[PDB]
Amino acid sequence: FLEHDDANRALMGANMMRQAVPLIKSESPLVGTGMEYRSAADAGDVVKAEKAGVVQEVSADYITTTNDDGTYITYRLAKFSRSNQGTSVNQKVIVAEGDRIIEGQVLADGPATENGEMALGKNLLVAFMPWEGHNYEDAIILSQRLVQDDVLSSIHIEEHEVDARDTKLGPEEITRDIPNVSEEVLADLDERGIIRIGAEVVAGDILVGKVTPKGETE
Amino acid sequence: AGRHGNKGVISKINPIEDMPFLEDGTPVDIILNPLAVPSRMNPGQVLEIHLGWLASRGWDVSGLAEEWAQRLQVIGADKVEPGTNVATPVFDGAREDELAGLLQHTIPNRDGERMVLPSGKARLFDGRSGEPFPEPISVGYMYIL
Amino acid sequence: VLGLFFLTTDSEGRSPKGEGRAFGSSAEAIMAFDAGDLTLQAKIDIRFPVGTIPPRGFEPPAREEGEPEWQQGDTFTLKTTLGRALFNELLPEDYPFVDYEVGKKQLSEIVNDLAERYPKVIVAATLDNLKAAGFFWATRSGVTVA
Amino acid sequence: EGIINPPIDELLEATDSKYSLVIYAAKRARQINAYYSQLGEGLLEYVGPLVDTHVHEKPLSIALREINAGLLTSEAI
Amino acid sequence: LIAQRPSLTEEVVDEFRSRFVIEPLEPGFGYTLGNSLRRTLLSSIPGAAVTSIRIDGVLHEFTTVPGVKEDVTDLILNIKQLVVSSEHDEPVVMYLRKQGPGLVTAADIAPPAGVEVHNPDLVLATLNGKGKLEMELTVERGRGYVSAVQNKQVGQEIGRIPVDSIYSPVLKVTYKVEATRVEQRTDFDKLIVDVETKQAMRPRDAMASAGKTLVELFGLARELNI
Amino acid sequence: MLIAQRPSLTEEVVDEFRSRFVIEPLEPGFGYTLGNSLRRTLLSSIPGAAVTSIRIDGVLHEFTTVPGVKEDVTDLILNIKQLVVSSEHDEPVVMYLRKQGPGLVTAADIAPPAGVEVHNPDLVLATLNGKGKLEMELTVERGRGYVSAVQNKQVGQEIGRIPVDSIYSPVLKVTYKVEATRVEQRTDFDKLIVDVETKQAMRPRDAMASAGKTLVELFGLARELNIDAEGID
């Protein structure tokens, strides 16, 4: 319904749909223009078949298909990888164990897509009414069902790095034996001073233990 | 934000029992100010919402012998199951008569009664006080980003 | 402002039930509204307790009596809707009764008069009351977009 | 039970200006806070809270309370 | 002016959906009682839910189990819809073990004594030939909704991941009023409350618990007076 | 499961009949249930007594002018409906008021029959000048809540009887507000404040106790379905 919207609001909406994060599981719009499939397939993050065949093996990490000419082609899927803005690029699967595949048919979804169709958000029940002033100046009131049912939530992956260098005084060491700290702080570190995979971490916690070799001592 | 330039920060995540709810106990998921839309001059979101509702509970149009009904029959949008996605191209969308007539002929949900009036608004209760709101409140499904 | 306007507007185009019936007090009018036989915008004859300042236009008229009377400090009956009674319940008791559609510009002159003639804490309390009741009655005003 | 708990119009009618009132209350708050940090030195120039005080209260609230109560004066040198 | 004590009558339309009728209510009063019942039913009703799990070979909810088409977060989503009942106040560990190709659902789970699943048709995941799923789902008892951040208590167990648990077993509550056929100008109203719950229990028990909570709070408001 | 803190109703009195009641912190979302249910069962479910019809001598239903009284019939109806009466008969009873000569007629001059009592004797009713000719008969009927003016073909039987609005409920107005309170680092607890103003006949706290009573045997209907437990104390 673009022809009903104002040109300024159309500008804002078009420039603002690019900021929509991909959610946990996405659903394609209940009402929306039919170009969404073409706008999702032409973007290359959706895994499409290079050749026509039949699915042989399906999993969360890969899809192995046997094409009709006889070759065996495996598509790997990026699961919980970091995009340039911090959002995940997790790719769901929509094909079954043994269904037929044609060329260009969508095998696996991408971030913010459902069934190969673009899905930038969720469809929610809406009522227009002033409600006790909490939707004032176009603010948002919403149910807790969008919190408990995991509707509007997103995985955010942040990368953060450090390097142990060779400065003038000596070589920086990645070590567990951090000085002037209690034992419980460094409890979750590895033998070489690395936080373990899947270790829940909070602000101020030790991620990787790097010590500078020495400083002018007075 | 929606797709029509409407945006806003979240001021309160209400409990489910505090949201206004429909005639079947279905709470609404998001409350929007109707003050914004006539000043922003983007009524299309409202249009979207009506068709969103029409795509939630499907419609049965056959033999109605009306202009919009015959257009939907020759197009193919005459028998639509509930929940199925609908498509309005960006300048060949569903016309006013089609939305009005489909809101007339929305499939019932329970007790053989349909829940949104042909005006596009539904009688909506209060989750806090419990007394029903005086005038019908426009409800439907908007795709929120 | 939309809520206060809806509260204080006239009964034009909206079906008035219980229009033109005397009420002993504003509490009885509220009870009738809760019963449902009286609408918010309906010209009713409502009595007001002692200490309620009558409107500025109420002074040239008076009750017909063979004895001297002064309706400036004591009880009086007024032909007004219930919404104006609630709106003046928001306003301070020393402020004269307002008997017109408020909207926005009349709200501006009311707030300017309040800031001119009243201390800061009273003004802050009255704008808080106006804010709260404006949101409350804008929720029940039935405004929506279809 | 807040910032506005001293009514401000009383302070203006007891001061006749607004900048005089704010620097007046600031000086009194500084005196009270210096008294609290005396550590038992017993300095004569620092006079404690003349109004009643809770277990913990900002010196400026106490200062405005003494200005409002009218039990304290100031003169220009 | 007439005094008649209200009476509640239950009729059933499905296995887990029923309508309760309270006829002699005072005018202008059915809506508020129905709303109090609905708000007590939707939020504060005790139940049981899975509060944490532990998948063998998985350290956090962002990996993938080797041999299932749904990642661990989708597994969290599918477990979060599993409705259960736990008699034990203490948490109970349920076991789900599946080998080989197939479709692991809630019917394939092993519920201990005192803990019962109620929707065995709920699909949990899929397995190909090299798929192998072993989960130890911790189930607890409570009311309302408790997020995953409030469900974590152990730090030494890396593999255990908490899930956000939805305890309330009531799907939707509605109320409706009419006018009684008795002829007075008061026009008393009957209240019909449609309660539909999940498979955890029949709506009669849920309405009983809501009535217990409401009568306890109102007796608190009563007995402290006079 | 178990409730950490138990609420406790406290009363802060401000007048002879006006009062305010504060509930110590309730569970999240339980403020509004208690507030509106208590307000509606307070304003409507408490039984009381009031007038239902009046009869003025030598007047007609279309004749709004009363002889000998400066106040019109509307002010007289308003003052009668503003009067408090208590009854125990449980059928409508006719109560008289007669006065001759000039002066002020109040509720003190009203003569009540046995079993019917008037709690407000000092409020003014009307004025008389010259010849009084004041003979009114008013019907007192025990009821519950609030009912407007209703006619039952009594105008056909006699022309002097006109119905009057009835205020049965002892409470005059109830206003509830639910705000937020913080204990044990959890801000989402509700404090409910119920300001109740009643008439001078009945004590407000007795009315609130009766409302809580009616709510107890009203929500005991759901209890007889099943004996189910809940986390208490």
Side-chain angles (χ1 to χ4, degrees), chain A residues 1 4-5 128, chain B residues 4 6 34 37-38 42-53 99 119-120 138-142, chain C residues 144-146:
Chain A
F1 299 108
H4 300 74
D5 293 328
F128 290 104
Chain B
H4 321 269
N6 64 86
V37 58
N42 48 0
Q45 45 187 313
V46 180
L47 277 296
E48 173 196 11
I49 290 176
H50 298 340
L51 201 64
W53 183 263
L99 273 71
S119 178
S138 177
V139 289
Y141 279 74
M142 181 185 307
Chain C
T144 184
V145 294

PDB file of all heavy atoms in Angstrom, chain A residues 1 4-5 128, chain B residues 4 6 34 37-38 42-53 99 119-120 138-142, chain C residues 144-146:
ATOM      1  N   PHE A   1       0.827  -1.209   0.000  1.00  0.00           N
ATOM      2  CA  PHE A   1       0.000   0.000   0.000  1.00  0.00           C
ATOM      3  C   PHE A   1       0.862   1.260   0.000  1.00  0.00           C
ATOM      4  O   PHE A   1       0.645   2.194   0.774  1.00  0.00           O
ATOM      5  CB  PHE A   1      -0.974   0.002   1.180  1.00  0.00           C
ATOM      6  CG  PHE A   1      -1.940  -1.144   1.168  1.00  0.00           C
ATOM      7  CD1 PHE A   1      -1.816  -2.180   2.074  1.00  0.00           C
ATOM      8  CD2 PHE A   1      -2.967  -1.189   0.248  1.00  0.00           C
ATOM      9  CE1 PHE A   1      -2.698  -3.235   2.061  1.00  0.00           C
ATOM     10  CE2 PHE A   1      -3.853  -2.243   0.234  1.00  0.00           C
ATOM     11  CZ  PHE A   1      -3.717  -3.267   1.142  1.00  0.00           C
ATOM     12  N   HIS A   4      -0.782   4.678  -0.971  1.00  0.00           N
ATOM     13  CA  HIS A   4      -1.538   5.351   0.074  1.00  0.00           C
ATOM     14  C   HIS A   4      -0.648   6.122   1.037  1.00  0.00           C
ATOM     15  O   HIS A   4      -1.089   7.124   1.606  1.00  0.00           O
ATOM     16  CB  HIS A   4      -2.374   4.330   0.847  1.00  0.00           C
ATOM     17  CG  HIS A   4      -3.357   3.591  -0.002  1.00  0.00           C
ATOM     18  ND1 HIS A   4      -2.985   2.605  -0.889  1.00  0.00           N
ATOM     19  CD2 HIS A   4      -4.703   3.692  -0.099  1.00  0.00           C
ATOM     20  CE1 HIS A   4      -4.058   2.133  -1.498  1.00  0.00           C
ATOM     21  NE2 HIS A   4      -5.113   2.777  -1.036  1.00  0.00           N
ATOM     22  N   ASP A   5       0.593   5.685   1.229  1.00  0.00           N
ATOM     23  CA  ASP A   5       1.505   6.375   2.126  1.00  0.00           C
ATOM     24  C   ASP A   5       2.012   7.667   1.496  1.00  0.00           C
ATOM     25  O   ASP A   5       2.031   7.833   0.274  1.00  0.00           O
ATOM     26  CB  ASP A   5       2.694   5.482   2.482  1.00  0.00           C
ATOM     27  CG  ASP A   5       2.297   4.280   3.308  1.00  0.00           C
ATOM     28  OD1 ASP A   5       1.340   4.393   4.100  1.00  0.00           O
ATOM     29  OD2 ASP A   5       2.945   3.223   3.171  1.00  0.00           O
ATOM     30  N   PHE A 128      -5.341   0.374  17.381  1.00  0.00           N
ATOM     31  CA  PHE A 128      -5.112   1.812  17.489  1.00  0.00           C
ATOM     32  C   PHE A 128      -5.957   2.381  18.614  1.00  0.00           C
ATOM     33  O   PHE A 128      -7.178   2.502  18.480  1.00  0.00           O
ATOM     34  CB  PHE A 128      -5.439   2.545  16.193  1.00  0.00           C
ATOM     35  CG  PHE A 128      -4.493   2.271  15.080  1.00  0.00           C
ATOM     36  CD1 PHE A 128      -4.845   1.430  14.054  1.00  0.00           C
ATOM     37  CD2 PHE A 128      -3.267   2.909  15.031  1.00  0.00           C
ATOM     38  CE1 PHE A 128      -3.987   1.212  13.020  1.00  0.00           C
ATOM     39  CE2 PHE A 128      -2.396   2.680  13.998  1.00  0.00           C
ATOM     40  CZ  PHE A 128      -2.755   1.827  12.992  1.00  0.00           C
TER      41      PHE A 128
ATOM     42  N   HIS B   4       5.852   1.525   6.887  1.00  0.00           N
ATOM     43  CA  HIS B   4       5.283   2.760   6.363  1.00  0.00           C
ATOM     44  C   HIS B   4       5.814   3.978   7.104  1.00  0.00           C
ATOM     45  O   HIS B   4       5.088   4.940   7.355  1.00  0.00           O
ATOM     46  CB  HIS B   4       3.760   2.722   6.429  1.00  0.00           C
ATOM     47  CG  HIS B   4       3.179   1.388   6.093  1.00  0.00           C
ATOM     48  ND1 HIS B   4       2.814   1.035   4.812  1.00  0.00           N
ATOM     49  CD2 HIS B   4       2.912   0.313   6.869  1.00  0.00           C
ATOM     50  CE1 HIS B   4       2.338  -0.196   4.817  1.00  0.00           C
ATOM     51  NE2 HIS B   4       2.387  -0.658   6.052  1.00  0.00           N
ATOM     52  N   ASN B   6       6.466   4.415  10.138  1.00  0.00           N
ATOM     53  CA  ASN B   6       6.048   4.547  11.525  1.00  0.00           C
ATOM     54  C   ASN B   6       7.088   3.892  12.421  1.00  0.00           C
ATOM     55  O   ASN B   6       7.578   2.802  12.118  1.00  0.00           O
ATOM     56  CB  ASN B   6       4.666   3.927  11.742  1.00  0.00           C
ATOM     57  CG  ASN B   6       4.641   2.435  11.491  1.00  0.00           C
ATOM     58  OD1 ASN B   6       4.943   1.642  12.378  1.00  0.00           O
ATOM     59  ND2 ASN B   6       4.268   2.046  10.281  1.00  0.00           N
ATOM     60  N   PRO B  34      -3.307   6.152  17.484  1.00  0.00           N
ATOM     61  CA  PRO B  34      -3.937   6.604  16.240  1.00  0.00           C
ATOM     62  C   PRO B  34      -3.763   8.088  15.977  1.00  0.00           C
ATOM     63  O   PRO B  34      -4.223   8.573  14.939  1.00  0.00           O
ATOM     64  CB  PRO B  34      -5.417   6.254  16.447  1.00  0.00           C
ATOM     65  CG  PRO B  34      -5.590   5.985  17.899  1.00  0.00           C
ATOM     66  CD  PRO B  34      -4.270   6.049  18.590  1.00  0.00           C
ATOM     67  N   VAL B  37      -1.021   8.719  12.713  1.00  0.00           N
ATOM     68  CA  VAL B  37      -1.257   8.437  11.290  1.00  0.00           C
ATOM     69  C   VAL B  37      -1.915   9.567  10.499  1.00  0.00           C
ATOM     70  O   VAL B  37      -1.475   9.818   9.367  1.00  0.00           O
ATOM     71  CB  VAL B  37      -1.957   7.078  11.132  1.00  0.00           C
ATOM     72  CG1 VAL B  37      -3.254   7.009  11.874  1.00  0.00           C
ATOM     73  CG2 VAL B  37      -2.190   6.750   9.666  1.00  0.00           C
ATOM     74  N   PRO B  38      -2.930  10.303  10.993  1.00  0.00           N
ATOM     75  CA  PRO B  38      -3.485  11.355  10.125  1.00  0.00           C
ATOM     76  C   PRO B  38      -2.545  12.536   9.943  1.00  0.00           C
ATOM     77  O   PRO B  38      -2.599  13.198   8.901  1.00  0.00           O
ATOM     78  CB  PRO B  38      -4.781  11.770  10.842  1.00  0.00           C
ATOM     79  CG  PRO B  38      -4.953  10.811  11.962  1.00  0.00           C
ATOM     80  CD  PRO B  38      -3.575  10.397  12.314  1.00  0.00           C
ATOM     81  N   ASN B  42       0.096   8.861   6.273  1.00  0.00           N
ATOM     82  CA  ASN B  42       0.357   7.520   5.751  1.00  0.00           C
ATOM     83  C   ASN B  42      -0.743   6.574   6.213  1.00  0.00           C
ATOM     84  O   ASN B  42      -0.523   5.720   7.078  1.00  0.00           O
ATOM     85  CB  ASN B  42       1.737   7.014   6.176  1.00  0.00           C
ATOM     86  CG  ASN B  42       2.008   7.214   7.651  1.00  0.00           C
ATOM     87  OD1 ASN B  42       1.173   7.741   8.380  1.00  0.00           O
ATOM     88  ND2 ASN B  42       3.177   6.782   8.100  1.00  0.00           N
ATOM     89  N   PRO B  43      -1.946   6.685   5.636  1.00  0.00           N
ATOM     90  CA  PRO B  43      -3.033   5.772   6.016  1.00  0.00           C
ATOM     91  C   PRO B  43      -2.810   4.336   5.584  1.00  0.00           C
ATOM     92  O   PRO B  43      -3.528   3.452   6.066  1.00  0.00           O
ATOM     93  CB  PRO B  43      -4.252   6.369   5.303  1.00  0.00           C
ATOM     94  CG  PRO B  43      -3.685   7.063   4.134  1.00  0.00           C
ATOM     95  CD  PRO B  43      -2.365   7.615   4.573  1.00  0.00           C
ATOM     96  N   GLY B  44      -1.833   4.083   4.708  1.00  0.00           N
ATOM     97  CA  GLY B  44      -1.614   2.761   4.151  1.00  0.00           C
ATOM     98  C   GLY B  44      -1.378   1.683   5.182  1.00  0.00           C
ATOM     99  O   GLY B  44      -1.818   0.547   4.975  1.00  0.00           O
ATOM    100  N   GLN B  45      -0.719   2.021   6.298  1.00  0.00           N
ATOM    101  CA  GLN B  45      -0.544   1.059   7.381  1.00  0.00           C
ATOM    102  C   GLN B  45      -1.880   0.507   7.850  1.00  0.00           C
ATOM    103  O   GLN B  45      -2.028  -0.716   7.972  1.00  0.00           O
ATOM    104  CB  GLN B  45       0.205   1.693   8.555  1.00  0.00           C
ATOM    105  CG  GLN B  45      -0.266   3.079   8.947  1.00  0.00           C
ATOM    106  CD  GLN B  45       0.620   3.724   9.992  1.00  0.00           C
ATOM    107  OE1 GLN B  45       0.979   3.098  10.987  1.00  0.00           O
ATOM    108  NE2 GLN B  45       0.977   4.981   9.770  1.00  0.00           N
ATOM    109  N   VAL B  46      -2.869   1.386   8.045  1.00  0.00           N
ATOM    110  CA  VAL B  46      -4.214   0.948   8.394  1.00  0.00           C
ATOM    111  C   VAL B  46      -4.731  -0.034   7.357  1.00  0.00           C
ATOM    112  O   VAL B  46      -5.211  -1.121   7.707  1.00  0.00           O
ATOM    113  CB  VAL B  46      -5.150   2.161   8.536  1.00  0.00           C
ATOM    114  CG1 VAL B  46      -6.546   1.709   8.898  1.00  0.00           C
ATOM    115  CG2 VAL B  46      -4.612   3.129   9.569  1.00  0.00           C
ATOM    116  N   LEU B  47      -4.565   0.302   6.070  1.00  0.00           N
ATOM    117  CA  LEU B  47      -4.946  -0.610   4.997  1.00  0.00           C
ATOM    118  C   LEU B  47      -4.284  -1.960   5.189  1.00  0.00           C
ATOM    119  O   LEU B  47      -4.966  -2.995   5.232  1.00  0.00           O
ATOM    120  CB  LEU B  47      -4.543  -0.036   3.638  1.00  0.00           C
ATOM    121  CG  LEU B  47      -5.387   0.988   2.878  1.00  0.00           C
ATOM    122  CD1 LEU B  47      -6.739   0.415   2.487  1.00  0.00           C
ATOM    123  CD2 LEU B  47      -5.518   2.292   3.635  1.00  0.00           C
ATOM    124  N   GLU B  48      -2.960  -1.946   5.404  1.00  0.00           N
ATOM    125  CA  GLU B  48      -2.204  -3.170   5.639  1.00  0.00           C
ATOM    126  C   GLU B  48      -2.827  -3.977   6.760  1.00  0.00           C
ATOM    127  O   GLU B  48      -3.136  -5.165   6.587  1.00  0.00           O
ATOM    128  CB  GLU B  48      -0.756  -2.817   5.973  1.00  0.00           C
ATOM    129  CG  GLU B  48       0.085  -3.990   6.404  1.00  0.00           C
ATOM    130  CD  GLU B  48       1.369  -3.581   7.088  1.00  0.00           C
ATOM    131  OE1 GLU B  48       1.521  -2.386   7.409  1.00  0.00           O
ATOM    132  OE2 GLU B  48       2.231  -4.456   7.300  1.00  0.00           O
ATOM    133  N   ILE B  49      -3.132  -3.302   7.871  1.00  0.00           N
ATOM    134  CA  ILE B  49      -3.703  -3.962   9.033  1.00  0.00           C
ATOM    135  C   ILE B  49      -4.995  -4.672   8.682  1.00  0.00           C
ATOM    136  O   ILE B  49      -5.167  -5.853   9.014  1.00  0.00           O
ATOM    137  CB  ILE B  49      -3.875  -2.938  10.165  1.00  0.00           C
ATOM    138  CG1 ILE B  49      -2.500  -2.550  10.689  1.00  0.00           C
ATOM    139  CG2 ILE B  49      -4.818  -3.401  11.222  1.00  0.00           C
ATOM    140  CD1 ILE B  49      -2.554  -1.512  11.696  1.00  0.00           C
ATOM    141  N   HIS B  50      -5.881  -4.007   7.934  1.00  0.00           N
ATOM    142  CA  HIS B  50      -7.131  -4.659   7.568  1.00  0.00           C
ATOM    143  C   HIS B  50      -6.860  -5.911   6.755  1.00  0.00           C
ATOM    144  O   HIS B  50      -7.348  -6.996   7.099  1.00  0.00           O
ATOM    145  CB  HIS B  50      -8.039  -3.693   6.813  1.00  0.00           C
ATOM    146  CG  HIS B  50      -8.436  -2.495   7.614  1.00  0.00           C
ATOM    147  ND1 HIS B  50      -8.375  -2.473   8.991  1.00  0.00           N
ATOM    148  CD2 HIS B  50      -8.912  -1.286   7.239  1.00  0.00           C
ATOM    149  CE1 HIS B  50      -8.786  -1.297   9.428  1.00  0.00           C
ATOM    150  NE2 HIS B  50      -9.119  -0.559   8.386  1.00  0.00           N
ATOM    151  N   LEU B  51      -5.980  -5.812   5.754  1.00  0.00           N
ATOM    152  CA  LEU B  51      -5.687  -7.002   4.974  1.00  0.00           C
ATOM    153  C   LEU B  51      -4.940  -8.025   5.806  1.00  0.00           C
ATOM    154  O   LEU B  51      -5.148  -9.230   5.622  1.00  0.00           O
ATOM    155  CB  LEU B  51      -4.899  -6.653   3.716  1.00  0.00           C
ATOM    156  CG  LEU B  51      -5.054  -7.759   2.675  1.00  0.00           C
ATOM    157  CD1 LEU B  51      -6.502  -7.868   2.242  1.00  0.00           C
ATOM    158  CD2 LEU B  51      -4.184  -7.497   1.488  1.00  0.00           C
ATOM    159  N   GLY B  52      -4.125  -7.560   6.759  1.00  0.00           N
ATOM    160  CA  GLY B  52      -3.496  -8.484   7.683  1.00  0.00           C
ATOM    161  C   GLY B  52      -4.529  -9.304   8.423  1.00  0.00           C
ATOM    162  O   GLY B  52      -4.436 -10.535   8.469  1.00  0.00           O
ATOM    163  N   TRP B  53      -5.581  -8.642   8.919  1.00  0.00           N
ATOM    164  CA  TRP B  53      -6.662  -9.373   9.564  1.00  0.00           C
ATOM    165  C   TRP B  53      -7.317 -10.326   8.579  1.00  0.00           C
ATOM    166  O   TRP B  53      -7.591 -11.486   8.911  1.00  0.00           O
ATOM    167  CB  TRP B  53      -7.689  -8.401  10.137  1.00  0.00           C
ATOM    168  CG  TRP B  53      -8.783  -9.087  10.870  1.00  0.00           C
ATOM    169  CD1 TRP B  53     -10.010  -9.420  10.386  1.00  0.00           C
ATOM    170  CD2 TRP B  53      -8.752  -9.533  12.227  1.00  0.00           C
ATOM    171  NE1 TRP B  53     -10.747 -10.047  11.358  1.00  0.00           N
ATOM    172  CE2 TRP B  53      -9.993 -10.131  12.498  1.00  0.00           C
ATOM    173  CE3 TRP B  53      -7.791  -9.487  13.240  1.00  0.00           C
ATOM    174  CZ2 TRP B  53     -10.304 -10.672  13.739  1.00  0.00           C
ATOM    175  CZ3 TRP B  53      -8.100 -10.027  14.468  1.00  0.00           C
ATOM    176  CH2 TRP B  53      -9.345 -10.611  14.709  1.00  0.00           C
ATOM    177  N   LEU B  99     -11.238  -4.847   0.230  1.00  0.00           N
ATOM    178  CA  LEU B  99     -11.058  -4.947   1.678  1.00  0.00           C
ATOM    179  C   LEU B  99     -12.389  -4.888   2.415  1.00  0.00           C
ATOM    180  O   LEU B  99     -12.623  -5.680   3.336  1.00  0.00           O
ATOM    181  CB  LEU B  99     -10.127  -3.850   2.197  1.00  0.00           C
ATOM    182  CG  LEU B  99      -8.614  -4.083   2.215  1.00  0.00           C
ATOM    183  CD1 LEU B  99      -8.018  -4.076   0.837  1.00  0.00           C
ATOM    184  CD2 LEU B  99      -7.942  -3.038   3.087  1.00  0.00           C
ATOM    185  N   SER B 119     -17.045  -2.270   9.411  1.00  0.00           N
ATOM    186  CA  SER B 119     -16.346  -0.995   9.485  1.00  0.00           C
ATOM    187  C   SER B 119     -14.845  -1.156   9.671  1.00  0.00           C
ATOM    188  O   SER B 119     -14.122  -0.159   9.590  1.00  0.00           O
ATOM    189  CB  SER B 119     -16.912  -0.150  10.625  1.00  0.00           C
ATOM    190  OG  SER B 119     -16.213   1.079  10.734  1.00  0.00           O
ATOM    191  N   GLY B 120     -14.363  -2.373   9.919  1.00  0.00           N
ATOM    192  CA  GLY B 120     -12.959  -2.615  10.156  1.00  0.00           C
ATOM    193  C   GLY B 120     -12.545  -2.571  11.608  1.00  0.00           C
ATOM    194  O   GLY B 120     -11.381  -2.859  11.911  1.00  0.00           O
ATOM    195  N   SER B 138     -10.171  -0.338  16.131  1.00  0.00           N
ATOM    196  CA  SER B 138      -9.653  -0.983  14.932  1.00  0.00           C
ATOM    197  C   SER B 138      -8.506  -1.919  15.284  1.00  0.00           C
ATOM    198  O   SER B 138      -7.530  -1.509  15.917  1.00  0.00           O
ATOM    199  CB  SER B 138      -9.182   0.067  13.933  1.00  0.00           C
ATOM    200  OG  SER B 138      -8.620  -0.535  12.784  1.00  0.00           O
ATOM    201  N   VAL B 139      -8.619  -3.177  14.860  1.00  0.00           N
ATOM    202  CA  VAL B 139      -7.624  -4.196  15.161  1.00  0.00           C
ATOM    203  C   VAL B 139      -7.241  -4.918  13.879  1.00  0.00           C
ATOM    204  O   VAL B 139      -7.960  -4.893  12.879  1.00  0.00           O
ATOM    205  CB  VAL B 139      -8.117  -5.214  16.208  1.00  0.00           C
ATOM    206  CG1 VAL B 139      -8.201  -4.574  17.578  1.00  0.00           C
ATOM    207  CG2 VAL B 139      -9.455  -5.785  15.793  1.00  0.00           C
ATOM    208  N   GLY B 140      -6.081  -5.562  13.928  1.00  0.00           N
ATOM    209  CA  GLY B 140      -5.625  -6.358  12.797  1.00  0.00           C
ATOM    210  C   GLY B 140      -4.205  -6.830  13.005  1.00  0.00           C
ATOM    211  O   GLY B 140      -3.760  -6.996  14.135  1.00  0.00           O
ATOM    212  N   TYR B 141      -3.497  -7.045  11.902  1.00  0.00           N
ATOM    213  CA  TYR B 141      -2.139  -7.581  11.966  1.00  0.00           C
ATOM    214  C   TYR B 141      -1.197  -6.688  11.172  1.00  0.00           C
ATOM    215  O   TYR B 141      -1.276  -6.640   9.941  1.00  0.00           O
ATOM    216  CB  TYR B 141      -2.098  -9.015  11.441  1.00  0.00           C
ATOM    217  CG  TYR B 141      -2.532 -10.054  12.450  1.00  0.00           C
ATOM    218  CD1 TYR B 141      -3.869 -10.211  12.780  1.00  0.00           C
ATOM    219  CD2 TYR B 141      -1.607 -10.882  13.062  1.00  0.00           C
ATOM    220  CE1 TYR B 141      -4.273 -11.160  13.694  1.00  0.00           C
ATOM    221  CE2 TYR B 141      -1.998 -11.831  13.981  1.00  0.00           C
ATOM    222  CZ  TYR B 141      -3.332 -11.967  14.291  1.00  0.00           C
ATOM    223  OH  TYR B 141      -3.722 -12.915  15.208  1.00  0.00           O
ATOM    224  N   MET B 142      -0.297  -5.998  11.866  1.00  0.00           N
ATOM    225  CA  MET B 142       0.760  -5.241  11.207  1.00  0.00           C
ATOM    226  C   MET B 142       2.080  -5.985  11.340  1.00  0.00           C
ATOM    227  O   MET B 142       2.364  -6.591  12.376  1.00  0.00           O
ATOM    228  CB  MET B 142       0.910  -3.822  11.772  1.00  0.00           C
ATOM    229  CG  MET B 142       2.002  -3.004  11.068  1.00  0.00           C
ATOM    230  SD  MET B 142       2.434  -1.364  11.682  1.00  0.00           S
ATOM    231  CE  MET B 142       0.853  -0.559  11.749  1.00  0.00           C
TER     232      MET B 142
ATOM    233  N   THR C 144      -9.860   6.045  17.166  1.00  0.00           N
ATOM    234  CA  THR C 144      -9.101   5.017  16.474  1.00  0.00           C
ATOM    235  C   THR C 144      -9.103   5.387  15.002  1.00  0.00           C
ATOM    236  O   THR C 144      -9.799   6.312  14.579  1.00  0.00           O
ATOM    237  CB  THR C 144      -9.697   3.628  16.701  1.00  0.00           C
ATOM    238  OG1 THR C 144      -8.860   2.641  16.087  1.00  0.00           O
ATOM    239  CG2 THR C 144     -11.081   3.554  16.102  1.00  0.00           C
ATOM    240  N   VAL C 145      -8.314   4.668  14.216  1.00  0.00           N
ATOM    241  CA  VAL C 145      -8.295   4.874  12.778  1.00  0.00           C
ATOM    242  C   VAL C 145      -8.639   3.565  12.084  1.00  0.00           C
ATOM    243  O   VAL C 145      -7.969   2.544  12.282  1.00  0.00           O
ATOM    244  CB  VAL C 145      -6.958   5.458  12.290  1.00  0.00           C
ATOM    245  CG1 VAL C 145      -6.786   6.850  12.852  1.00  0.00           C
ATOM    246  CG2 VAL C 145      -5.792   4.622  12.769  1.00  0.00           C
ATOM    247  N   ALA C 146      -9.725   3.581  11.327  1.00  0.00           N
ATOM    248  CA  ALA C 146     -10.069   2.527  10.397  1.00  0.00           C
ATOM    249  C   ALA C 146     -10.122   3.151   9.014  1.00  0.00           C
ATOM    250  O   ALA C 146      -9.952   4.363   8.854  1.00  0.00           O
ATOM    251  CB  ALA C 146     -11.399   1.862  10.766  1.00  0.00           C
TER     252      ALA C 146
END
